[PDB]
Amino acid sequence: KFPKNFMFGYSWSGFQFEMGLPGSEVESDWWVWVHDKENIASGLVSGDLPENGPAYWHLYKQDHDIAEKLGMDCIRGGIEWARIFPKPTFDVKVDVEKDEEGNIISVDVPESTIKELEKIANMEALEHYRKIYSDWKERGKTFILNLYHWPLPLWIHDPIAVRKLGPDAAPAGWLDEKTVVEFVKFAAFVAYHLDDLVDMWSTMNEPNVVYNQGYINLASGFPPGFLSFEAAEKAKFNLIQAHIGAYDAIKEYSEKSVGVIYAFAWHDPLAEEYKDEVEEIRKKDYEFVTILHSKGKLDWIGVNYYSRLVYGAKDGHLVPLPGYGFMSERGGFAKSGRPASDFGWEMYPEGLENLLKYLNNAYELPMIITENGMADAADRYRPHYLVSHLKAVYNAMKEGADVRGYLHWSLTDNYEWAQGFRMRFGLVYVDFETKKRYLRPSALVSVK
């Protein structure tokens, strides 16, 4: 048994879910990126398109109904910046204070600025977000809103251009210090308008995945797809600012818990001799969260756990080894003998149990499993994945970890970014031609 107040649910993100029937469609850096001819042709993206997705924007009522009757009481979803401000906000001026080193101290966004923003915002789309959030909230359920889930406005980031001409030649995204301010406006705008429907906030989702995959692991098919550690560091730095600033903006219009949602790989030493060196890596990997903790800008943490990384020696440097964790064979078995998801991600509930105790000891904050699931078209392993991983959470809690819920990823199949639709994470299958929902048997583990 889990505590009386422990929430069960799921999570969705705008890009992967909203689009699917005409009307839905929204220009963003990511959109352009998955439509780019060069990218599709070179195999760097699936060539699947998000406008062929599950169409949640229209079909949210059914999905909610399904989740409800599956006993779910909490959803964590998003709102898409590029959907709310298709047109730039730069001309709506705000007073911004900076120190010597070039840090952000404040960004005043009064009620009047919100009104000036209403003029150029898509209030049509905002109203639709209300309908969607209300549909769930008025059922007497909990909702968590996450402000950023990767796509940016085209007027913020043009990844094609950035890649061909370099960041000085186009809207550079999280490389332009300007982008942080505009995001802050966005945060305040959203707080002001939607707080009545939100129980808890998250400034952003997996920002570590964004800066690392976009500017270092080119193989990932993330934008803008060019190699530079300096770029990565800079993007990381501005994402930290964006969080801090958005935290202050939400607080100025809401009295609720604000946190962040983060990609927590569990790191494991192949051999006992590396144990120390691997803990050093844990620190570096989670540093993003460590930082925000130390500035007092985290009321809670969104844990997103899937698999692990195993480190060993190669030609003298210590690196993450193939055949383990996220680097296992797709639809096969890791070296450990654990099976892997269709994404080639090892099944490793142990990691989550270890992780939660690590994060509780390190931060002593309230946590929610804001993402946990697997790509399994066949529902071959999902049922065990679920039950094993819930057991892992339950164990961590017994040893003192403060965990207030679990949100699976996800209710329905959706658009797994550069991998298209071949990665299906849903407890509910979706026929992307008919947009029809059919539950996988694993969905009934949840009816409990």
Residue numbers in the entry: 2 to 449
Share the article's original sentences.
One of the β-glucosidases from Pyrococcus furiosus (BGLPf) is found to be a hyperthermophilic tetrameric enzyme that can degrade cellooligosaccharides. Cellulase systems consist of three categories of cellulase that catalyze the conversion of cellulose into glucose: endoglucanases (EGs), cellobiohydrolases (CBHs) and β-glucosidases (BGLs). The structure of BGLPf shows a stable homotetrameric structure forming 222 point-group symmetry.
The asymmetric unit exhibits a unique duplicated hexameric ring structure that includes the 12 monomers; one of the rings includes six monomers named A, C, E, G, I and K, and the other also includes six monomers named B, D, F, H, J and L. The arrangement of monomers therefore generates a local sixfold symmetrical axis that is not parallel to any of the crystal axes a, b and c, and hence the space group is P1. Analysis of the protein interfaces by PISA did not reveal sufficient interactions that could result in the formation of stable quaternary structures. The deletion of the C-terminal region of BGLPf, which drastically altered the crystal packing into space group P1, did not however affect the individual structures of monomeric BGLPf. The results indicated that BGLPf-M6ΔC (63 kDa) is monomeric in aqueous solution. The hydrodynamic radius of BGLPf-M6ΔC was estimated to be 3.1 nm.
